[PDB]
Amino acid sequence: HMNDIKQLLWNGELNVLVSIDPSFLMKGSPREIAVLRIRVPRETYLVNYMPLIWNKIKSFLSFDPEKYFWFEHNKTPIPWNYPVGVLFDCLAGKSAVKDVLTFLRIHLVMGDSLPPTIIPIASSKTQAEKFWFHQWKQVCFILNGSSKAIMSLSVNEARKFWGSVITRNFQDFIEISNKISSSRPRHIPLIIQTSRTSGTFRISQPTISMTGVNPTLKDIEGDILDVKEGDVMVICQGIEIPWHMLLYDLYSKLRSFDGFLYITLVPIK
């Protein structure tokens, strides 16, 4: 059922190897300082781990805490403002005394010339919450036609909503997310992306009306395929999704923790 499925997504979790570039550290500091081996939920943001990072390297920093900070994967800038699982799917591709280790390698970097479209890691401890709540405000509007449902939550209710993401309180998350919208969607909050690993990466947020209709993924093939296509596998929440899958079902069950349903397109052959 739905909640069982949502519980599986909530329990989603990855092995993440974080490396701190020497640029942040004092020449000669212990190896263990620049490395963190952690478990990170698919439904969260990498930025929620800055406190953990800072607390470990504080005593060995190479500066007094005008450079910018951001994450990278194999020398390629990676946006912190997407759920970790979505970043993973984008990097994994078809991947959806010797063993296969499934993990995400992340490197904390600094610099003066902030990379294109990259939102730097802030010192403002409400950066993620502010961005995330703004995500849900858009979602409420997309789903209900208005943002009334979310604006009506008490201030503490909204804080409790974000709080559940940090504490992993499934009950609270389900409680508030459902309150924002539990009716049938007017439109679907859908984001479509390709790979950040292979080829020319692209992302789109097509407008998809749901009033009086019940489209399948195939039905919206016009938003998924490009002009050149007029050989694509759809990956959502790290798994393969059939073309006959109903969009309402997909959204209502597999949407991410920021309220948006994300699909990753990967070449089959």
Partner: protein, 36 residues
């Protein structure tokens, strides 16, 4: 339900595979979700 059964099956498998060798990533064992 069979579609839901398909979802559960693939998501469970996903979690299992992604949980493999988690013993090597225990530096935040007491704070999975990070911190405020």
């Amino acid at each position: 339900d069979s579609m839901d059964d398909l979802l559960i099956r693939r998501l469970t498998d996903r979690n299992d595979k992604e949980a493999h060798l988690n013993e090597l990533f225990q530096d935040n064992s007491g704070a999975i979700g990070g911190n405020i």
